[PDB]
Amino acid sequence: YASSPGGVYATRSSAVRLRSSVPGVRLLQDSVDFSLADAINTEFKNTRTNEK
Amino acid sequence: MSTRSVSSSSYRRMFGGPGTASRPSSSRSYVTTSTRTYSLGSALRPSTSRSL
């Protein structure tokens, strides 16, 4: 037998990484969150440690 | 990334302040006039001895 590991296409997130307009006219509203999305990346680590 | 930074431009029109309707500064920064009138109070009674 020969199982392929192909299909693992990691999507590079490419957020603008610049605050509103030039150096900004707002600051509070930039969505402090994304350590949620990296804690969901460890949820999908522990989900695959579960699922398998 | 946004923020909740307040976005005031000029934002309530643009025209200066309320603010100077140019109240006319009349030229009473001149000197008040010289009231130099004169009374010829003497020659108007031609006081001469015709007894000659």
- Interface residues of chain B, partner chain A, Cβ below 8 Å: 1-7
- Resolution (angstroms) equals 7.2
Q: What is the DSSP track for A4-52? A: --TT------------STTTTS--S-S-TTTHHHHHHHHHHHHHHHHH-
Contacts of A25 in chain B (CB under 8 A): 5-7
The answer to whether B3 and A28 have CB atoms below 8 angstroms apart is: yes
Return the residue of A nearest to B7 by Cα: A25
Method: cryo-EM
The three state secondary structure string of B1-52 is: CCCCCCCCCCCCCCCCCCCCCCCCCCCCCCCCCCCCCCCCCCCCCCCCCCCC
